[PDB]
């Protein structure tokens, strides 16, 4: 009775061009390449599927990821049966890593597992910095992470004091000693240490996103020329010719051409 | 009443308008072919643009309309 | 060299009908024309090997073999520039 | 016949005091045009500038028949000069160039103490060499978490297009809110 | 052609997740409180303050800062 | 005021009637000098010739204030000129 509102000649022809896309990041695909029915278990969000496979990965649990889902499943029991997405979803993430990590168990602190270091993420949550489930938590459970602190009860907000953006504009005003947006602002308040990496790239090699993604991952191939537009009609042609070996100061010569000019640029070999 | 110039050509030529049109502070564009992809008057306004890869190289800068 | 399987091919314009790529690694097992030499519309012009596995590179139309850049036993990568035709 | 100008480039910190900067020249385009001689000095690339010499880089002179007009191309054979590895005068001299009591050529040797906005200078820009770094580096070290390889063959991606007018007379459901809350 | 730590045993403090030191916090002799915090560790989006288990005096230290650190690695120990 | 010489370098080699010589440019040195103009056109570093231009890589023009000096201006930057891998007209 009812149908989907939409172009499909146009959606196969948006198909066909991520099929090739997808292909400039493979380097980031999961393990997953069959639908799993025991996700009814695990009950672990598909956008952080991925993310956490990675994060695993860094870990060195890459091969054991399977190993971090029945955690994960076992986790979700131990704090009472919880919703997990973003950002529950973390801390049910974190939990089952670190868990993994250590042979530790759900007996590894019911009578038993003390002083053990549990994550950001995850004393956040029993603080309450997350929120209040439903059903709350085990005291005999929390007590053993958070000693020290006690739970905050009411929604965080409402005892956070606000932010003094005033002071955030003159910080950052006074490091970049320029103009200064209201999205730098809360960019900045957000993400703190991010967005101050963001800047120290940004000073050191300018606006990146206008690479293509496999020069943006794996730069230029001798004989290679590459087209970069950067505004209608404005675009940088640059050929890399050869590299050097690196002379005595670890550092190589590449022979570049850029838009009709001979140009030699020095960088250090790691 | 020239805010923007375009040169239909390439070569000696393009370049030595294109810096007098800077001198008078005026913004340049040039056309190049595709046997042009490299001659360096491509690289010496502040836009440019292909032709057309419809078109012969000897004929890309003769189509008045393109 | 002492062995030519150290040569850098240029790749392949792959918007370009003359340009034939190298679909796959493998090696040149024969060379089969030669530079500037007539061929019709799907002829055998080099034995490729993959996987101890032959096939034969044949060509897409009626041509005059313009470059190739191959001898036989030259190694060869996804995306080279094997031969030109007009 | 006309008239002629002529700057020299130095190596001179304009904001430190016009103290002669030293190092390596990694890098130097010079413009040309007509009515234009450069007489290169230290200025060119791979030269050692060296703490014991005068310290002129170029010395730049144009020509044409209105000082206006010579002015003119003082100002592009400046704004075209790119040398790295050193801070210049560049900035400073275009400034001289455009200021109106230079070109009136009523001024005196006060004229620079008495014109503190010539020194209203911007730290440089350099959007195309910071790309060659950028490339420079992924190439020989490579990518965080990307596996450390030849750039993989990659399919020739065929993008399709709409023009700008066609969008801009479609009514979607943002004209919709736009519209009706 | 790094000593690791006692589990089990004497109060050492094990590393518990592998990373990166991001600062160490307590000097090699110095007194210190239950809970206190140690020394601050960094993994991809994983951060475990390491805090005080006893209540004591500090030995040793195992770490600066920017180390590298493996699970099971000596970065403290305490009486 | 005095005197302007101009000629053009072609890809025309006079030992062969003139017959635009075609493919790549592996060497360059443009000179210049004072009272010398460069204009420069297919003469470059890397990129290569086609056929299907006028052959032109620089027009040269030179200017003193007698005929003589112009002219040993041109010799001078003719002399100093180095194009290599197409042949020239300078000769
Ligand atoms: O920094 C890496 C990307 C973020 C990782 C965590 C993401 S956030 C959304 C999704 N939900 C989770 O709890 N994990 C992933």
């Given at each position: 009775?009812?149908?989907?509102?939409?172009?499909?000649?146009?959606?196969?022809?948006?198909?066909?061009?991520?099929?090739?896309?997808?292909?400039?990041?493979?380097?980031?695909?999961?393990?997953?390449k069959?639908?799993?029915?025991?996700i009814?278990?695990?009950?672990?969000p598909?956008?952080?599927?991925?993310?956490?496979?990675?994060?695993?990965?860094?870990?060195?649990?890459?091969?054991?990821?399977?190993?971090?889902?029945?955690?994960?499943?076992?986790?979700?029991?131990?704090?009472?049966?919880?919703?997990?997405?973003?950002?529950?979803?973390?801390?049910?993430?974190?939990?089952?890593?670190?868990?993994?990590?250590?042979?530790?168990?759900?007996?590894?602190?019911?009578?038993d597992?003390?002083?053990?270091?549990?994550?950001?993420?995850?004393?956040?949550?029993?603080?309450?910095?997350?929120?209040?489930?439903?059903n709350?938590?085990?005291?005999?459970?929390?007590?053993?992470?958070?000693?020290?602190?006690?739970?905050?009860?009411?929604?965080?907000?409402?005892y956070?004091?606000?932010?003094?953006?005033?002071?955030?504009?003159?910080?950052?005003?006074?490091?970049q000693?320029?103009?200064?947006?209201?999205?730098?602002?809360?960019?900045?308040?957000?993400?703190?240490?991010?967005?101050?990496?963001?800047?120290?790239?940004?000073?050191?090699?300018?606006?990146?996103?206008?690479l293509?993604?496999?020069?943006?991952?794996?730069?230029?191939?001798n004989?290679?020329?590459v087209?970069?537009?950067?505004?209608?009609?404005?675009?940088?042609?640059?050929?890399?010719?050869?590299?050097?070996?690196?002379?005595?100061?670890?550092?190589?010569?590449?022979?570049?051409?850029?838009?009709?000019?001979?140009?030699?640029?020095?960088?250090?070999?790691? | 009443?020239?805010?923007?110039?375009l040169?239909?050509n390439?070569?000696?030529?393009?370049?030595?308008?294109?810096?007098?049109?800077?001198?008078?502070?005026?913004?340049?564009?040039?056309?190049?072919?595709?046997?042009?992809?490299?001659?360096?008057?491509?690289?010496?306004?502040?836009?440019?643009?292909?032709?057309?890869?419809?078109?012969?190289?000897?004929?890309?800068?003769?189509?008045?309309?393109? | 060299?002492?062995?030519?399987?150290?040569?850098?091919?240029?790749?392949?314009?792959?918007?370009?009908?003359?340009?034939?790529?190298?679909?796959?690694?493998?090696?040149?097992?024969?060379?089969?024309?030669?530079?500037?030499?007539?061929?019709?519309?799907?002829?055998?012009?080099?034995?490729?090997?993959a996987?101890?596995?032959?096939?034969?590179?044949?060509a897409?139309?009626?041509?005059?073999?313009?470059?190739?850049?191959?001898?036989?036993?030259?190694?060869?990568?996804?995306?080279?520039?094997?031969?030109?035709?007009? | 016949?006309?008239?002629?100008?002529?700057?020299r480039?130095?190596?001179?910190?304009?904001?430190?005091?016009?103290?002669?900067?030293?190092?390596?020249?990694?890098?130097?385009?010079?413009?040309?045009?007509?009515?234009?001689?450069?007489?290169?000095?230290?200025?060119?690339?791979?030269?050692?500038?060296?703490?014991?010499?005068?310290?002129?880089?170029?010395?730049?002179?144009?020509?044409?028949?209105?000082?206006?007009?010579?002015?003119?191309?003082?100002?592009?054979?400046?704004?075209?000069?790119?040398?790295?590895?050193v801070?210049?005068?560049?900035?400073?001299?275009?400034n001289?160039?455009?200021?109106?009591?230079?070109?009136?050529?009523?001024?005196?040797?006060?004229?620079?103490?008495?014109?503190?906005?010539?020194?209203?200078?911007?730290?440089?820009?350099?959007?195309?060499?910071?790309?060659?770094?950028?490339?420079?580096?992924?190439?020989?070290?490579?990518?965080?978490?990307?596996?450390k390889?030849?750039?993989?063959?990659?399919?020739?991606?065929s993008?399709?297009?709409?023009?700008?007018?066609?969008?801009?007379?479609?009514?979607?459901?943002?004209?919709?809110?736009?519209?009706?809350?």
């Amino acid at each position: 009775p009812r149908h989907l509102r939409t172009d499909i000649e146009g959606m196969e022809s948006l198909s066909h061009y991520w099929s090739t896309v997808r292909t400039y990041y493979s380097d980031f695909e999961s393990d997953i390449k069959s639908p799993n029915t025991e996700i009814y278990q695990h009950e672990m969000p598909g956008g952080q599927y991925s993310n956490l496979s990675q994060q695993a990965k860094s870990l060195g649990l890459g091969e054991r990821f399977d190993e971090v889902k029945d955690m994960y499943r076992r986790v979700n029991f131990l704090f009472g049966d919880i919703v997990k997405v973003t950002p529950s979803s973390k801390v049910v993430g974190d939990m089952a890593l670190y868990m993994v990590q250590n042979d530790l168990d759900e007996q590894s602190v019911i009578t038993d597992g003390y002083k053990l270091d549990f994550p950001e993420s995850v004393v956040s949550f029993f603080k309450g910095e997350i929120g209040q489930p439903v059903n709350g938590f085990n005291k005999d459970l929390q007590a053993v992470i958070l000693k020290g602190q006690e739970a905050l009860t009411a929604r965080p907000g409402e005892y956070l004091e606000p932010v003094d953006f005033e002071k955030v504009r003159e910080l950052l005003e006074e490091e970049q000693q320029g103009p200064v947006t209201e999205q730098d602002i809360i960019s900045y308040v957000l993400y703190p240490k991010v967005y101050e990496q963001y800047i120290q790239t940004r000073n050191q090699y300018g606006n990146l996103s206008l690479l293509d993604t496999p020069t943006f991952f794996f730069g230029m191939r001798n004989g290679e020329t590459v087209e970069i537009e950067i505004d209608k009609g404005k675009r940088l042609i640059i050929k890399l010719e050869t590299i050097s070996e690196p002379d005595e100061n670890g550092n190589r010569t590449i022979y570049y051409a850029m838009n009709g000019q001979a140009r030699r640029i020095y960088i250090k070999d790691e | 009443q020239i805010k923007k110039l375009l040169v239909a050509n390439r070569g000696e030529i393009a370049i030595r308008i294109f810096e007098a049109a800077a001198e008078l502070d005026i913004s340049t564009v040039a056309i190049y072919s595709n046997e042009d992809k490299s001659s360096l008057h491509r690289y010496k306004a502040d836009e440019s643009y292909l032709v057309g890869s419809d078109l012969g190289p000897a004929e890309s800068y003769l189509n008045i309309e393109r | 060299n002492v062995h030519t399987n150290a040569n850098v091919k240029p790749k392949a314009d792959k918007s370009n009908p003359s340009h034939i790529g190298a679909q796959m690694p493998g090696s040149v097992t024969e060379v089969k024309v030669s530079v500037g030499e007539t061929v019709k519309a799907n002829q055998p012009l080099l034995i490729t090997e993959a996987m101890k596995m032959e096939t034969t590179i044949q060509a897409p139309f009626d041509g005059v073999i313009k470059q190739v850049t191959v001898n036989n036993g030259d190694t060869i990568a996804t995306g080279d520039l094997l031969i030109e035709i007009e | 016949l006309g008239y002629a100008i002529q700057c020299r480039i130095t190596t001179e910190d304009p904001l430190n005091d016009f103290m002669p900067d030293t190092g390596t020249i990694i890098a130097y385009r010079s413009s040309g045009g007509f009515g234009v001689r450069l007489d290169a000095g230290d200025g060119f690339q791979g030269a050692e500038i060296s703490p014991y010499y005068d310290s002129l880089l170029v010395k730049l002179s144009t020509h044409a028949i209105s000082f206006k007009q010579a002015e003119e191309k003082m100002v592009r054979s400046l704004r075209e000069m790119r040398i790295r590895g050193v801070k210049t005068n560049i900035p400073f001299l275009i400034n001289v160039m455009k200021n109106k009591k230079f070109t009136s050529g009523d001024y005196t040797t006060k004229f620079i103490e008495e014109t503190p906005e010539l020194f209203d200078i911007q730290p440089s820009l350099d959007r195309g060499t910071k790309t060659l770094e950028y490339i420079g580096n992924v190439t020989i070290n490579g990518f965080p978490n990307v596996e450390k390889r030849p750039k993989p063959d990659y399919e020739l991606a065929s993008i399709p297009t709409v023009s700008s007018s066609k969008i801009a007379s479609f009514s979607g459901t943002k004209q919709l809110l736009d519209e009706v809350g």
